Design brief:
The structure is a homodimer. The first copy, chain A, is an alpha/beta fold. Chain A has twelve helices and 17 strands. In chain A, helix 3 runs antiparallel to helix 6 and helix 4 packs antiparallel against helix 5. The interface between A and B is large, with 54 and 55 residues. Chains A, B: Pfam families: IF-2B.
Chain lengths: ~350, ~350
């Protein structure tokens, strides 16, 4: 596989989370699509508050924001003796760690660095600082390049033409480029992307609010639709292939993703339209046998009873699963940052972890 | 077929449209679900205004209100000569006809009275008046007694259990009780209905805003959900049967309904859940042979771009097909007011019009 494109060649957005001159820069996704604004945070409790807020969202972006938060602490602490610094590092690691104790990449970033700093406890203070900062950059860089690889892999296997996607797996879900967003962004540059359909994606509407804004921002050709309409456009032959991301893939390739991903798979299947999940290897948890092992988060009823600002329902019972589980059999294949994986995924996934 | 109930025993709501002491009463559907309020119209130009506003909606309720407007005129005309009274009746017929010059039942209703009055033009003035009033009541009564029949037919062929539905085909879509509405209201009274799922139904949200409130008012057990979640509650086996209205059935049983319906069809398919459509006999068009002979309406991009009041998207192209077409093979049966119809739909449907 060759990477034929650099980040700048693919999008014109900055990165979703960035560190510069002892400060952390985030695109403020709470202000989208109305207003595009980069926030600048120069304290950890501001970075921490920007994680709770959901100023930043996307697992790899919630990681990077955290990493750089520690970077921010390293290059910022007034601690003179190494012993003060380590007690203050741990203070900030706890502050950061207790933002959305549910989002899993956060815990990953914060530990990777926690262990590094347990590792070099005896080195000089100014040296440990360098190491922290450095690793924060690694973490982040790491994601963009996984995203690059995924893109170029995906652009090989998907057809030219009309693609339909779901929720938000663009640049803004990631450090930069996106998982899905990489693929379509590569296709666009090649010119194999004639049309991208977007499910607004209720209840949280992240398809309307973020995905249409960012693919639109880069001049890609986008048609926003209601979720109900996915089937119809499929019926009419207006969709050559369907790509979604995935929040968790498990051993047999079954996977969980934002609600309505199962709907699509079943439909993609009725019109013999190819259907692919895209995600890096870290999203694959080999621990879990099958889809029935993935716990289902229900969120507040208010997400359904309202829509944007406005209320739209009487007070009545609601069912708001934030994710569904799509059985492996509906997967044409699974794009990852170490290549495309085909049936049978059970075997070829363990293989994929063996070879890495 | 026995009718084991009256409308009073099945709903605690008024008739969507009603006519009483020389005045049209309609439930203001524009103020739901926030406020419940029956408006009182006294002048034909107000009744015509409430068809336009969409204060009133649903083909038979629109048909009933346009007829009752002519009832209004007959009992309110300051006319002295019959020559005058048939000038001013033509004048009103036009005011009514120029409201939503598509909605089919309005044409029907207006014409049925128009024909009746021409036919009996030789008659005495107050003889003719009485005939208009009598006739406007028939049109409203007929829809209700069809409704009541369907209701009782549908409660037969459907299973006891959790039922899932789409958009609003309840009391508020008819003169009284609804099509689908009648069915669940019958099952509820019999206690054969443990749960009724409600697809919120983007883009227009008639599920959330209308069906949830109206079936809620009658104390049914309901749960609103995002359209994206239908497939998932099917998958968990929380759905025993799916019932939907239809805005137009053609010869082969192919049919057209609010966008999302075809999606449900294909998903009931994949989980072997029985899928039924319910309509009066007048909602079947024998002229049209197959689904592909049905014109597909698009509506304003604003219906997708926004939600309740709020905007939720950047200005990007949209596709807002307001209705999909569901091919006949997905239909377990078609429930009507003259019984139920089984595959092959083509033949049993033309039969049913001869014997009627």
């Amino acid at each position: 596989m060759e990477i034929r494109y650099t980040p700048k060649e693919l999008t014109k957005l900055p990165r979703t989370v960035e560190y510069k001159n002892k400060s952390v820069y985030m695109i403020n996704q709470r202000l989208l699509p109305k207003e595009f604004k980069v926030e600048k945070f120069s304290k950890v409790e501001e970075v921490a508050e920007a994680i709770k807020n959901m100023t930043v969202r996307g697992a790899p972006a919630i990681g990077a924001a955290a990493g750089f938060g520690l970077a921010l602490y390293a290059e910022t602490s007034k601690a003179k003796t190494k012993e003060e610094f380590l007690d203050g590092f741990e203070k900030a690691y706890e502050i950061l760690k207790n933002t959305r104790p549910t989002a899993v990449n956060l815990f990953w970033a914060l530990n990777r660095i926690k262990k590094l700093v347990e590792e070099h406890s005896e080195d000089p203070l100014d040296e440990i600082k360098r190491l922290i900062v450095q690793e924060a950059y690694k973490i982040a860089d790491e994601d963009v390049e996984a995203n690059l690889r995924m893109g170029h892999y995906g652009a090989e296997v998907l057809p030219e033409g009309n693609i339909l996607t779901h929720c938000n797996a663009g640049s803004l879900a990631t450090v930069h480029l996106g998982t899905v967003g990489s693929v379509v962004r590569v296709m666009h540059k090649d010119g194999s992307l004639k049309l991208l359909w977007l499910d607004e994606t209720r209840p949280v509407l992240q398809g309307a609010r973020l995905s249409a804004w960012e693919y639109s921002y880069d001049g890609l050709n986008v048609k926003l639709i209601a979720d109900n309409a996915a089937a119809f456009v499929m019926q009419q032959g207006f969709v050559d292939a369907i790509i979604v991301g995935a929040d968790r893939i498990v051993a047999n390739g079954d996977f969980a993703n934002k609600i309505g991903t199962y709907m699509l798979a079943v439909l993609a299947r009725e019109h013999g339209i190819p259907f692919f999940a895209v995600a890096p290897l870290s999203s694959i948890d080999m621990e879990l046998k099958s889809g029935k092992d993935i716990p289902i988060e229900e969120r507040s009823p208010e997400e359904v009873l309202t829509c944007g600002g406005c209320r739209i329902a009487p007070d009545v019972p609601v069912y708001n699963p934030a994710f569904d589980v799509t059985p492996h059999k509906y997967l044409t294949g699974i794009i990852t940052d170490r290549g495309v994986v085909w049936p049978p995924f059970k075997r070829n996934l363990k293989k994929l972890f063996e070879v890495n």
